[PDB]
Amino acid sequence: SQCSSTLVKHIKAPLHLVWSIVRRFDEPQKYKPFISRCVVQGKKLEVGSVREVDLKSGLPATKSTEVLEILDDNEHILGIRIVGGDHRLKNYSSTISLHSETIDGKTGTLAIESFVVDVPEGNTKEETCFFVEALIQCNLNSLADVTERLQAESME
Ligand SMILES: O=C(Cc1cc(C2CC2)c(-n2cc(CNC(=O)c3cnc4ccccc4n3)nn2)c(C2CC2)c1)NC1(C(=O)O)CCCCC1
After folding, report:
1. H-helix or E-strand spanning residue 114
2. Is the CB of 22 under 6 A from ligand 1?
3. Does 89 contact ligand 1 (Cβ within 6 A)?
4. Which parts of the sequence form the motif Gate loop?
5. Domain that holds residue 97
6. Which residues contact 44 (CB under 8 A, 6 or more apart)?
7. What's the distance, CA 94 to chain centroid?
Protein backbone atom coordinates (compact mmCIF):
# COMPACT_ATOMS: atom_id res chain seq x y z
CA SER A 1 0.00 0.00 0.00
CA GLN A 2 0.91 3.67 -0.26
CA CYS A 3 0.43 6.94 1.55
CA SER A 4 -0.29 9.98 -0.63
CA SER A 5 -0.90 13.40 0.88
CA THR A 6 -0.59 17.13 0.31
CA LEU A 7 0.52 19.85 2.71
CA VAL A 8 0.03 23.60 2.38
CA LYS A 9 2.07 26.42 3.94
CA HIS A 10 1.42 30.16 3.84
CA ILE A 11 4.71 32.10 3.86
CA LYS A 12 5.03 35.85 4.48
CA ALA A 13 7.80 36.44 1.93
CA PRO A 14 7.72 37.16 -1.83
CA LEU A 15 7.74 34.24 -4.25
CA HIS A 16 11.05 35.15 -5.87
CA LEU A 17 12.79 34.95 -2.48
CA VAL A 18 11.14 31.68 -1.47
CA TRP A 19 11.77 30.11 -4.89
CA SER A 20 15.44 31.12 -4.82
CA ILE A 21 15.72 28.82 -1.79
CA VAL A 22 13.43 25.97 -2.87
CA ARG A 23 14.96 25.69 -6.35
CA ARG A 24 18.46 24.90 -5.01
CA PHE A 25 18.31 21.13 -5.51
CA ASP A 26 21.98 21.13 -4.46
CA GLU A 27 21.40 22.92 -1.11
CA PRO A 28 18.40 21.38 0.70
CA GLN A 29 20.18 21.93 4.03
CA LYS A 30 19.50 25.67 3.74
CA TYR A 31 16.04 25.01 5.20
CA LYS A 32 15.53 21.26 5.82
CA PRO A 33 16.63 20.92 9.47
CA PHE A 34 17.47 17.21 9.39
CA ILE A 35 19.91 17.49 6.46
CA SER A 36 23.62 18.27 6.98
CA ARG A 37 25.29 18.27 3.55
CA CYS A 38 24.48 17.65 -0.10
CA VAL A 39 26.63 17.01 -3.20
CA VAL A 40 25.56 17.10 -6.86
CA GLN A 41 27.84 16.23 -9.77
CA GLY A 42 27.90 17.99 -13.13
CA LYS A 43 25.20 20.50 -14.04
CA LYS A 44 23.62 20.61 -10.60
CA LEU A 45 20.15 21.80 -11.63
CA GLU A 46 19.31 19.60 -14.62
CA VAL A 47 16.57 16.96 -14.83
CA GLY A 48 18.16 13.64 -13.98
CA SER A 49 20.69 15.27 -11.63
CA VAL A 50 21.46 13.06 -8.65
CA ARG A 51 22.07 14.52 -5.20
CA GLU A 52 23.81 12.59 -2.43
CA VAL A 53 22.35 13.84 0.86
CA ASP A 54 24.01 13.51 4.28
CA LEU A 55 21.63 13.52 7.21
CA LYS A 56 22.49 15.10 10.53
CA SER A 57 24.34 12.82 12.94
CA GLY A 58 22.26 10.91 15.44
CA LEU A 59 19.44 9.71 13.17
CA PRO A 60 18.59 6.10 12.25
CA ALA A 61 19.61 6.72 8.61
CA THR A 62 22.68 8.62 7.40
CA LYS A 63 22.25 9.23 3.66
CA SER A 64 19.71 9.55 0.85
CA THR A 65 20.21 9.44 -2.92
CA GLU A 66 17.61 11.52 -4.77
CA VAL A 67 16.93 12.34 -8.43
CA LEU A 68 15.72 15.64 -9.86
CA GLU A 69 12.54 14.80 -11.79
CA ILE A 70 11.19 18.31 -12.42
CA LEU A 71 12.68 21.80 -12.18
CA ASP A 72 10.32 24.41 -13.71
CA ASP A 73 11.67 27.91 -13.09
CA ASN A 74 8.68 29.46 -14.86
CA GLU A 75 5.87 27.84 -12.86
CA HIS A 76 8.01 27.18 -9.74
CA ILE A 77 7.70 23.40 -9.54
CA LEU A 78 10.33 21.11 -8.02
CA GLY A 79 9.87 17.34 -8.18
CA ILE A 80 12.27 14.76 -6.70
CA ARG A 81 12.39 11.01 -6.18
CA ILE A 82 14.40 9.10 -3.57
CA VAL A 83 16.32 6.20 -5.16
CA GLY A 84 18.72 5.00 -2.47
CA GLY A 85 19.98 5.47 1.07
CA ASP A 86 20.09 3.57 4.37
CA HIS A 87 16.50 4.42 5.31
CA ARG A 88 13.18 2.62 4.84
CA LEU A 89 11.39 4.99 2.43
CA LYS A 90 10.77 3.07 -0.80
CA ASN A 91 9.37 4.66 -3.95
CA TYR A 92 9.20 8.09 -2.33
CA SER A 93 8.54 10.99 -4.66
CA SER A 94 7.31 14.52 -4.09
CA THR A 95 6.38 17.74 -5.82
CA ILE A 96 6.44 21.22 -4.34
CA SER A 97 5.06 24.25 -6.17
CA LEU A 98 5.00 27.91 -5.11
CA HIS A 99 2.40 30.54 -5.91
CA SER A 100 2.03 34.22 -5.16
CA GLU A 101 -0.81 35.26 -2.87
CA THR A 102 -1.99 38.13 -0.69
CA ILE A 103 -2.63 37.58 3.03
CA ASP A 104 -3.43 40.49 5.38
CA GLY A 105 -2.99 42.87 2.45
CA LYS A 106 0.67 41.88 1.98
CA THR A 107 2.32 39.79 -0.71
CA GLY A 108 3.28 36.27 0.30
CA THR A 109 3.86 32.77 -1.06
CA LEU A 110 1.75 29.63 -1.01
CA ALA A 111 3.75 26.40 -0.94
CA ILE A 112 1.94 23.19 -1.92
CA GLU A 113 3.91 19.98 -1.37
CA SER A 114 2.57 16.52 -2.28
CA PHE A 115 4.17 13.11 -1.84
CA VAL A 116 3.59 9.43 -2.56
CA VAL A 117 5.50 6.70 -0.70
CA ASP A 118 5.20 2.98 -0.10
CA VAL A 119 4.10 1.77 3.32
CA PRO A 120 7.17 -0.14 4.58
CA GLU A 121 7.01 -3.59 6.10
CA GLY A 122 6.31 -3.30 9.83
CA ASN A 123 4.44 0.01 9.72
CA THR A 124 0.80 0.90 9.13
CA LYS A 125 -0.33 3.28 6.42
CA GLU A 126 -1.41 5.68 9.17
CA GLU A 127 2.05 5.62 10.75
CA THR A 128 3.66 6.20 7.36
CA CYS A 129 1.46 9.20 6.55
CA PHE A 130 2.09 10.65 10.00
CA PHE A 131 5.88 10.21 9.73
CA VAL A 132 6.18 11.89 6.32
CA GLU A 133 3.60 14.59 7.04
CA ALA A 134 5.30 15.62 10.29
CA LEU A 135 8.66 15.95 8.52
CA ILE A 136 7.29 17.88 5.54
CA GLN A 137 5.45 20.17 7.97
CA CYS A 138 8.74 20.69 9.81
CA ASN A 139 10.45 21.55 6.50
CA LEU A 140 7.69 23.94 5.38
CA ASN A 141 7.71 25.62 8.79
CA SER A 142 11.47 25.98 8.50
CA LEU A 143 11.23 27.34 4.94
CA ALA A 144 8.81 29.99 6.21
CA ASP A 145 11.15 30.85 9.10
CA VAL A 146 14.21 31.09 6.84
CA THR A 147 12.58 33.17 4.11
CA GLU A 148 10.59 35.43 6.43
CA ARG A 149 13.85 36.17 8.24
CA LEU A 150 15.63 36.92 4.96
CA GLN A 151 12.72 39.20 4.13
CA ALA A 152 13.00 41.09 7.42
CA GLU A 153 16.78 41.39 7.00
CA SER A 154 16.31 42.97 3.54
CA MET A 155 13.94 45.68 4.79
CA GLU A 156 15.16 49.06 5.97
O1 LIG B 1 13.49 16.19 5.10
C2 LIG B 1 13.89 15.04 4.91
C3 LIG B 1 15.14 14.54 5.64
C4 LIG B 1 15.13 13.24 6.19
C5 LIG B 1 15.36 12.10 5.40
C6 LIG B 1 15.39 10.83 5.99
C7 LIG B 1 15.60 9.67 5.22
C8 LIG B 1 16.69 9.74 4.18
C9 LIG B 1 15.24 9.74 3.74
C10 LIG B 1 15.20 10.69 7.39
N11 LIG B 1 15.25 9.49 7.99
C12 LIG B 1 14.45 8.41 7.93
C13 LIG B 1 15.02 7.54 8.76
C14 LIG B 1 14.57 6.12 9.10
N15 LIG B 1 13.11 5.92 9.01
C16 LIG B 1 12.51 5.63 7.86
O17 LIG B 1 13.11 5.54 6.78
C18 LIG B 1 11.13 5.41 7.97
C19 LIG B 1 10.41 5.03 6.85
N20 LIG B 1 9.04 4.80 6.96
C21 LIG B 1 8.43 4.95 8.14
C22 LIG B 1 7.06 4.72 8.24
C23 LIG B 1 6.43 4.87 9.47
C24 LIG B 1 7.17 5.25 10.58
C25 LIG B 1 8.54 5.48 10.48
C26 LIG B 1 9.18 5.33 9.26
N27 LIG B 1 10.50 5.54 9.15
N28 LIG B 1 16.11 8.09 9.30
N29 LIG B 1 16.24 9.17 8.86
C30 LIG B 1 14.99 11.83 8.17
C31 LIG B 1 14.84 11.72 9.58
C32 LIG B 1 13.51 11.31 10.15
C33 LIG B 1 14.00 12.74 10.31
C34 LIG B 1 14.97 13.09 7.56
N35 LIG B 1 13.36 14.20 4.00
C36 LIG B 1 12.21 14.53 3.14
C37 LIG B 1 12.56 15.79 2.31
O38 LIG B 1 11.62 16.56 2.00
O39 LIG B 1 13.75 15.92 1.97
C40 LIG B 1 10.95 14.75 3.98
C41 LIG B 1 10.51 13.47 4.66
C42 LIG B 1 10.26 12.39 3.62
C43 LIG B 1 11.54 12.13 2.83
C44 LIG B 1 11.97 13.41 2.13
Report:
1. strand 106-118
2. no
3. yes
4. 57-61
5. 1-156
6. 25, 26
7. 8
Residues in the chain, overall count:
156
What kind of experiment solved this structure? X-ray
Give the whole-angstrom CA distance, residue 94 versus residue 82: 9
How far apart (Å, rounded) are the C-alpha atoms in residues 18 and 151? 10
Residue-wise DSSP of 6-40 = EEEEEESS-HHHHHHHHT-TT-GGGT-TTEEEEEE
For this entry, resolution in Å reads 1.8
Residue 4 and residue 93: Cα distance in Å, rounded?
10
Binding residues: 32, 61-66, 88-94, 113
The CA distance from 110 to 122, in Å, is 35
